[PDB]
């Protein structure tokens, strides 16, 4: 089915405790294949997948060179946003950036994402046309003019429609065993309250419903082994829709 | 645009010294500050970007820091290859703006200039023009002033100056001031002199010749 | 990568200044390729950068005059200034912008563009008789002139100052030696001036007067 290559970056300002805590995480669908913790001793783009290890030097040296560029960009962006909102220097704030590209069954470009946040609130985002910007507040209008002078959208569109798609296809081929896998959830029920357990499914996109309805369902959660799990309960038929089951499953 | 300032304009230092260069911005530029090194006749070389990060290949003796509305470039254990001009460049808002530039010299004992004056050649006087040259030789530091005076009258606009680049043997500077006159104007004055002031001289030194 | 400017160094005033910067060792790619001018004696000024798609970000101070083009087929991006006055005389560096759009990492060697409506002229060498002696290389166009003393000898005390641009658009520099006063008569001093564009070779002998 469709695939995406998201890149999540988080920088948290530490007041008086040194440089900001930057954590860069790369995702292909719901599988994390790279990571970068600035507090780690490695100071390299640590691989988080077995298939990404098949790529040797002159790739990790390039990923590392670009992820310290994200770290340096995010560390400075923390001070830019603190001055935009006129905040104190003794507080801990966060900048979150997510960019990625979606594809389809033909693995051709489908959609592009590039969003920023400050303290959990939307700051700026790339519109679906990938030419215009949706600035949230008046502080993000200053970013909009600077990013429209630099044609950042065109460069981002070049990445999102170009490099991102070609690299996702390479990732989808390097890690076809894991990235392209699909596991049907192991649905089972427990016993009043009736609860159905969707276990060990990938990707995380699942749907659980109850029909004979004020259900009690939790978020899907990582099992830790590359899979996910979920459950829903109703006080007193559990229907599950996942890519691993072409036909609906009723419990 | 965001005008950029540097402090100090010049840093006379020696090998093994610790050198600190400061930069400022008219408006808030976040931490988007880059540091460049440029030797004479060559393109600038980036040393530090984002006010703290060191460029790949740059020696670790170069360091950058930012306290607030202020940026600092540090060279601990200065080396003979670190004598150049340094620029701070902002990139918070377009256009890109550079700093004025701070030059680092090889410090040495203060030497007062030796002043020589040159009357115009006769073969040039037959071409309808006259040029008077005042030479300032082997002085340190660079900051010297030469003022042209004929018949005890200061001039301006009609003079040009050229400076050497700290001769490697003794790390001293040399200066030449050219007074471009006309054959009609040159013949109308008797005494031509250049007054030289330098931090190595308690009093100004004047070299003069009579037409 | 390696960046090399390939533009004429002499642009007439109020004419179009065309400069080409070839990229060797790589490609134009998705980098932003900037034009930076450093006029002699002053700091760097940023003209603008070009993207491979032709989208360029000009400096608003000279946005109406500057045209920057890209020829990605030949891996060269060009600068086309228009109605160029004397204020455009500068060393034009072509550079690559740093991957976080904040600095210029790779620089070209630089090209000196001279804005003057002056034809090629021969250097008129005049002696500077005494200590210190020299000779003045006045009213030559274009640069440079190489001044040497006694062919290849006399390498001590020689101070060849950078040339200045006069009010008439013709360059001029002075070369001075600092030989001891005890050899003024016994030793003869001749400065050799060589201007290749003018095909001029002057050997002027400097003697006390």
């Amino acid at each position: 089915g469709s695939h995406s290559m998201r890149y999540f970056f988080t920088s948290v300002s530490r007041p008086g405790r040194g440089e900001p805590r930057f954590i860069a995480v790369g995702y292909v669908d719901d599988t994390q294949f790279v990571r970068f913790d600035s507090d780690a001793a490695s100071q390299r783009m640590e691989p988080r997948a077995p298939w990404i290890e098949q790529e040797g030097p002159e790739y990790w040296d390039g990923e590392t060179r670009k992820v310290k560029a994200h770290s340096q960009t995010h560390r400075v962006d923390l001070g830019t946003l603190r001055g935009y909102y006129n905040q104190s220097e003794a507080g801990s704030h966060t900048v979150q950036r997510m960019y990625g590209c979606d594809v389809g069954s033909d693995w051709r470009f489908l959609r592009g994402y590039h969003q920023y946040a400050y303290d959990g609130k939307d700051y700026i985002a790339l519109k679906e046309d990938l030419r215009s910007w949706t600035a949230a507040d008046m502080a993000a209008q200053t970013t909009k003019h600077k990013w429209e002078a630099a044609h950042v959208a065109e460069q981002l569109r070049a990445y999102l429609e170009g490099t991102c798609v070609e690299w996702l296809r390479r990732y989808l081929e390097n890690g076809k065993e894991t990235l392209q896998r699909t596991d049907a959830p192991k649905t089972h029920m427990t016993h009043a309250t009736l609860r159905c357990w969707a276990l060990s499914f990938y990707p995380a996109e699942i749907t659980l419903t109850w029909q004979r309805q004020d259900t009690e369902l939790v978020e899907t959660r990582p099992a830790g082994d590359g899979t996910f799990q979920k459950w829903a309960a109703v006080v007193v038929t559990c229907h599950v829709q996942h890519e691993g089951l072409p036909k609906p499953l009723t419990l | 645009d965001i005008h950029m300032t540097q402090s100090p304009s010049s840093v006379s230092a020696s090998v093994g010294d610790r050198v600190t260069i400061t930069c400022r911005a008219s408006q808030g530029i976040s931490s988007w500050l880059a540091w460049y090194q440029q030797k004479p006749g060559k393109a600038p070389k980036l040393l530090i970007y984002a006010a703290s990060s060191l460029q790949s290949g740059v020696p670790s003796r170069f360091s950058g820091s930012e306290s607030g509305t202020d940026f600092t470039l540090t060279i601990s254990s200065l080396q003979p290859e670190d004598f150049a001009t340094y620029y701070c460049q902002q990139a918070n808002s377009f256009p890109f703006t550079f700093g004025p530039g701070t030059k680092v010299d090889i410090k040495r004992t203060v030497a007062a200039p030796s002043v020589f004056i040159f009357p115009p050649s006769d073969e040039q006087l037959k071409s309808g023009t006259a040029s008077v040259v005042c030479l300032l030789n082997n002085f340190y530091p660079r900051e010297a002033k030469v003022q042209w005076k004929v018949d005890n009258a200061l001039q301006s606009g009609n003079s040009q100056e050229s400076v050497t680049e700290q001769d490697s043997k003794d790390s001293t500077y040399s200066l030449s001031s050219t007074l471009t006159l006309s054959k009609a104007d040159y013949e109308k004055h008797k005494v031509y002199a250049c007054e030289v002031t330098h931090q190595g001289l308690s009093s100004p030194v004047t070299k003069s010749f009579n037409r | 990568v390696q960046l090399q400017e390939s533009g004429p160094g002499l642009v007439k005033p109020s004419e179009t200044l065309s400069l080409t910067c070839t990229v060797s060792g790589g490609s134009i790619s998705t980098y932003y390729w900037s034009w930076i001018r450093q006029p002699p004696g002053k700091g760097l000024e940023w003209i603008g950068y070009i993207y491979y798609s032709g989208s360029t970000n000009y400096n608003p101070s000279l946005k109406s005059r500057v045209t920057i083009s890209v020829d990605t087929s030949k891996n060269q991006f060009s600068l086309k200034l228009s109605s160029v006055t004397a204020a455009d005389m500068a060393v034009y560096y072509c550079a690559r912008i740093t991957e976080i759009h904040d600095a210029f990492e790779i620089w070209g060697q630089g090209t000196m563009v001279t804005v003057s409506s002056a034809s090629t002229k021969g250097p008129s060498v005049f002696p500077l008789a005494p200590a210190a002696l020299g000779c003045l290389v006045k009213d030559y166009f274009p640069e440079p002139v190489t001044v040497s003393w006694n062919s290849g000898a006399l390498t001590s005390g020689v101070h060849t100052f950078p040339a200045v641009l006069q009010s008439s658009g013709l360059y001029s520099l002075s070369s001075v030696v600092t030989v001891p006063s005890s050899s003024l008569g016994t030793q003869t001093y001749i400065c050799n001036v060589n201007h290749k564009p003018s095909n001029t070779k002057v050997d002027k002998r400097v003697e006390p007067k």
């Binding site: 790369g26 670009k66 992820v67 970013t143 990013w147 981002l156 | - | 759009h101």
Partner: peptide
Amino acid sequence: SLLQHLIGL
């Protein structure tokens, strides 16, 4: 691969 060309806020 990561986005090669970035820009500050």
